[model samples]
Target: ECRLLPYALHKWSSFSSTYLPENILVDKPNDQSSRWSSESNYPPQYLILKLERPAIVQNITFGKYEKTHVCNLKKFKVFGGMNEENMTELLSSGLKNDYNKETFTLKHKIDEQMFPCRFIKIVPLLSWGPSFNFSIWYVELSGIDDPDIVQPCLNW
Candidate 1:
């Protein structure tokens, strides 16, 4: 099982309406609303998720709306790295056609080389329908926990 590794949503290319990118941080999928959507009606939109720290990543869990027709993601690419400008491609695959969450294993080789990373970027390519804009029901990462600094403080 993957713990919601998005300690923070980090950043995104764009978001539609009030469906903020931060909504992906929520564990509970809000079904129809409170999700992340691309503001552009075209492909190549992106979403970057920061992991808890520079830890090993196993896979990425992608979930989308069940009944929705046009906004469900069909294919996408995954990347990971500490640097925002440069990242290594982890996985490039398609998601499930239904609402059931699909887990895409992360690695360079199919042999499952566990590469440690701090951030994950999702570049959505296309949707299930004729629409370019895609919506995400939820996003989470499966990985091993790493040591880190602990502090209870206000948001920056």
Candidate 2:
């Protein structure tokens, strides 16, 4: 199990504007604005994690910073692929629901359909509305790092 995001070997990005972009979802969940939020008019706010190298995605764990009302994510879609464009066509499994719970983990077994890829995208399709803002605390992907290829060094 590895925290394969916001680490030296990976990169993170989001489609919506964030209040605290510096403190990404990979940071531990705290009772503050370390989380990211969708812009006022942004629909289907999403976050992308690009791996340094292609790897086998075994599992994922997501956490919510606060047990708040109207801002938590309700349902989202997860996709994996070798690149951003292919990710759209490759749904990891199907639409995953959060159920208003704060933290949960999804484990993919060996017998299950494998999602090997260099990119993982999570789209917040719905939020606990009355307010339309989508919020996320932290996201982590556990996978085996590829050893065959040498990834380019990040410049910071």
Candidate 3:
């Protein structure tokens, strides 16, 4: 069964300060209303998503901006870690899709267990073309909410 994990569950989110903060990447996906658009054609830009606590990342999916598909991510990388600097390379090579509407499964090569992570960084290495700007419709993550951070409900 596919459980759709909303981006609103993210504790925090950020990107390069160059662009105006539209912050649609972490908002609830509601069509074209929420989206992150780049100001210029820049390589090596990153979008960071931090969870409330460490969680097992099972799958990730994203969509392109409805208006323009030119900005769809081409070459990108995925990294996970406790913090920004101390990150572990989850996906070393470029992403699979040339455009948007893509889903990536996160699993360990050896144990086949879900990858544990508190922070996820998506670096946009390249875009579809020379489009000065690009937009991301939404980003979604699916996984087990760590029991370590789970709080007792109605135990007040």
Candidate 4:
């Protein structure tokens, strides 16, 4: 069994080099967004955790702001589930097709109760603009998902 605690993983060359506040994707990008290098791409079937028991996930949050970058982030979503017992996967795959849908897309924070499932994902739908490209900067996963940090604030 895993204790409900906050766990974070960054999947970009720049993001992984060193953990800093400015590296955060949503730390107030100047009027636009940021750029994502090839290393920033997420791999598939990537298991982030292995839980002993099924978790009652409560929140899945992603933060981003107007910035300049490539690939207009029409939609960005993170999926979490298990391939084997106790294994949890976290990532964004095949998310390009779900872009611009008002239902799944959100301009700001997304409520936990908005959807229910042991695994949750986040999608940032970008409005086509002059920022060159939409950048889905920072993504945070919190809630009952973490066994150790399930009581207080969700910062992972």
Which candidate wins on TM-score?
1
Q: What's each prediction's TM-score?
A: 0.81, 0.65, 0.66, 0.36
Off by over 4 Å in 2: 1-18, 26-28, 88-115, 146-156
Indicate the residue-level lDDT of 36 in model 2.
67
lDDT of 1: 0.72
Please say which candidate is ahead in lDDT: 1 or 3: 1
Query: What's the TM for model 2?
Result: 0.65
* Candidate 4 clash figure, as a count: 23
Expressed as tens digits, the lDDT of each residue in 15-101 for candidate 3 is 334433335455433454456665555654566777665566667777655344556666667777646567776764434333336
- Which portions of model 1 miss their true places by more than 4 Å? 1-6, 27-30, 108-113, 147-156
After best superposition, candidate 4 residue 103: deviation in angstroms?
Answer: 12
Tens-place lDDT per residue, model 1, 21-118, is: 98776645445775788998565689888876666677788766655547777788899875777898888887767757778878823353344677
Model 1: lDDT of residue 47:
89
Instruction: Put down candidate 4 lDDT per residue, 1-156, tens digits, no spaces.
Output: 322324433222232223332333343435332323222334321213233343444444334444323444544445554233232234333223222212222212245322222333333334234332234444343334444433232333
Model 3 ranges with Cα > 4 A deviation: 1-22, 25-33, 92-100, 107-115, 148-156
Assess candidate 3 and give its TM-score to the true structure: 0.66
In candidate 4 the C-alpha lDDT for residue 55 amounts to 49
Q: Residue-wise lDDT of candidate 2 within 4-55, one digit each (tens)?
A: 5332213334424545433454555445566667664266466677766666
Q: TM-score order of candidates, best first? A: 1, 3, 2, 4
13, model 2: CA deviation in Å?
8.8
